Amino acid sequence: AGMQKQVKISGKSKENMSLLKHLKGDVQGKELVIEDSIVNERWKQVLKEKIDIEHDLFNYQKNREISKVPFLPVDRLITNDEVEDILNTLTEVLPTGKFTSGPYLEQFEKVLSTYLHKRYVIATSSGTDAIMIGLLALGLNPGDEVIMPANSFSATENAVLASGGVPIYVDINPQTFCIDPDKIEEAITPYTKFILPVHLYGKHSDMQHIRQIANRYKLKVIEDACQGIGLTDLGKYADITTLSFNPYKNFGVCGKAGAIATDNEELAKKCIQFSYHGFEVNVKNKKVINFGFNSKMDNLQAAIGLERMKYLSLNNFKRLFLADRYITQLAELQNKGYIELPELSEDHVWHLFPIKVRTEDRADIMTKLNEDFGVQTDVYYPILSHMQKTPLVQDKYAGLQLVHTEKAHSQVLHLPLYPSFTLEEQDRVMEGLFHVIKQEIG
Amino acid sequence: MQKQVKISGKSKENMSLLKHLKGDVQGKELVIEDSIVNERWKQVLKEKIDIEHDLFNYQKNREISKVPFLPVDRLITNDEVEDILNTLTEVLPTGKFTSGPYLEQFEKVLSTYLHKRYVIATSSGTDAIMIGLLALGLNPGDEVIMPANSFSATENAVLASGGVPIYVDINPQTFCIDPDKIEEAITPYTKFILPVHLYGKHSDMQHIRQIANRYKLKVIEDACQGIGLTDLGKYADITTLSFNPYKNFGVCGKAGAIATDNEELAKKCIQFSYHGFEVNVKNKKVINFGFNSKMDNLQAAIGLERMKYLSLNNFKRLFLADRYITQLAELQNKGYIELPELSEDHVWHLFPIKVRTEDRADIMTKLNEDFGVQTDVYYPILSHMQKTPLVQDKYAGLQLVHTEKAHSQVLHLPLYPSFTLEEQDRVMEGLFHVIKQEI
Ligand SMILES: Cc1ncc(COP(=O)(O)O)c(/C=N/[C@@H]2[C@@H](O)[C@@H](O)O[C@H](COP(=O)(O)O)[C@H]2O)c1O
């Protein structure tokens, strides 16, 4: 065509896939359109010139000796430039004395509203609190059943249990690690009120199919997107979307925080009431519901968030590049049936990078990677919900079998992946994996 | 032979220091206890200290047209900001903002300060109370006897975790729960007493403990406004604190703490505070559920700096309270207002006087309109008078005579550590002028 298609840089997952192809190419010109959003701020300087990803984004030093590769060194999750930006904003915020309530809260919620294309955003004190408040705002009563997967971080089930709800675990798709929509309908009872899909590891659940089931059975859908910021069409089919801004997330602040996003005004109002003591919105000390929590995000953290968010599109792109590099360079191990690699799909933001290895070999693979090559791997998370050793599980969740969740749980292995990870470290992870796995198979 | 004046920063010793420094000498040698809370005291405490000049930099003639009740920009000093920026310069590059090493250090210093074996730092005072109740074994429907004049957070912590507030009347002089009204409210469903050290005044904890022991009840105290009280926690199973930035000691965000001497109880608090996980074993739950309610490492680093100001600030608050009580004496002597008692068991988070029910609205308006003096009433609506379905279904018809009367009379005057004596002069002269014009 004589007509150049524009590449809209929104920083979202689907658009990042296109950007990946383009930034791998030679011509990087006017067709690359940076959307005027805070999330793209760090792209502005970077894209002034033609980019070589390996050198310009990763400072690839193939010849730098690597003797150990930590899975997630938290000191490297925040860059020197971020620290400088944060110290700068705190120099202005601290003398204001406004650390809990304050003006940065509304600005941060407004920026999120625009980014998520959701009318209302209520910033909370954590992702866990976002889920708990969202459930209550949606009308959860004690005993109401909430269909959910058993392989999320414990926060998901805790938010349900703390709100008085009853988790009903259903099996996952063992390739995507997300709730299998084909298993949801089987679990529905007259007590079911909610479906709580989790976009685990940053992979988008099958939300259209989930919404079809929810509509058929008049269920509400609250999605745990705490690991999924940047996903294209996040929240399209959900009544409530929840986010975490914990410092290890794709976008985080410097403490605990999260958010609830919704298009529904009455639901938003109820979220605000539950997030702040049950008070009438913007009228302190006057309760209009039975009770509420002390769970708004702090103004100080919102100010920090407005700085760290400037790095989000670039960071999510770097995560995608890393994931693409693992998938391509480890290809042979999957072609020969030794491992499973995730699919390079547009509906993933690569918070964690899961491969699957043989159940019988995983412990040895992890040990050998660490002992022989100093490569640290991990398994998020070590214990499934229905296998936790608690009185509730012992008393009520006995006899529950989730065949696919249990099998995938025994196979999954997470490889290091975060935006400041180096390609030379990634080289060592991959070479170590090739060496160890060929030792496993004989 | 020299008697020593020990400076601990706690309320009883502050009262002794006040008397000593006002020329009623309690001894010879000033001895500052080597505690974190006393660090900033060391910069200004000298043998011949002039409190008005050395601590308040009294500028009698400074031009003032407004006296805000609580300007939050003044609740944090330039020196605090400097200390905080310096600590954050070191914390930020560590990348440790939630879990981290300053947490344990902050808990340890609080443990030493409070003389409590175990301290669990939480994400707010509200969460401290909620977690404490759950750790003490609160089940849905269990009743918690408490006053109705606290901030809504107190009842909210009970209600959130399944509990049932049972409101009893206060002592209308102290604003604290009346221990003589507790026994009559006890039912087979009562498991807790939750006294509140309202405005910084210590509840009658020995009497509350006597009742609790008699009825086998647990005592969890809301001391969210009471940090610095002598013998805080002596008769409580759990003590809760808030480090909200407006408190006598606060951080730069939400935070709180639970303190207890009981190890198994502390273990349950830690479990509930962090996802129900085994203590220090992430991802392995040992109780049914938990919250994400630990204090952030970043705020703990900040608290380790701001706490250096606590003893000095609490003393400044006491000096201000004493100045109000002394200078407004005539208005009480002639029956126009009631002043709080100058007692050792107060840390003066808020300064409540009482005025006539019929005149309070006019007094507040005239102070503001005529003199630019802002006052306030903490808090505007009592628990059993909130317009919620629960109140209509359960607390309708409830009559708390002393609480409701005191609630209609209380007026809080500006009082915070960085408040100036020249502003306080304006508050006091304004009050005289407004009362006198009413007569
Ligand atoms: C799917 C999902 N839903 C919900 C949540 C809840 O989101 P917050 O409530 O915002 O955490 C999470 C959070 N997960 C991380 C967890 O991966 C681990 O790294 O531990 C950190 C905690 O580690 P620290 O305590 O060290 O911060 C948690 O933040 C989550 O992953």
Ligand SMILES: Cc1ncc(COP(=O)(O)O)c(/C=N/[C@@H]2[C@@H](O)[C@@H](O)O[C@H](COP(=O)(O)O)[C@H]2O)c1O
């Ligand atoms: C007796 C008692 N128990 C318990 C609590 C609960 O303590 P947190 O959960 O730590 O707040 C409190 C807290 N009270 C203050 C409140 O006075 C008001 O200033 O509003 C601020 C909040 O105002 P901002 O939202 O602007 O910070 C609250 O911190 C309390 O006072």
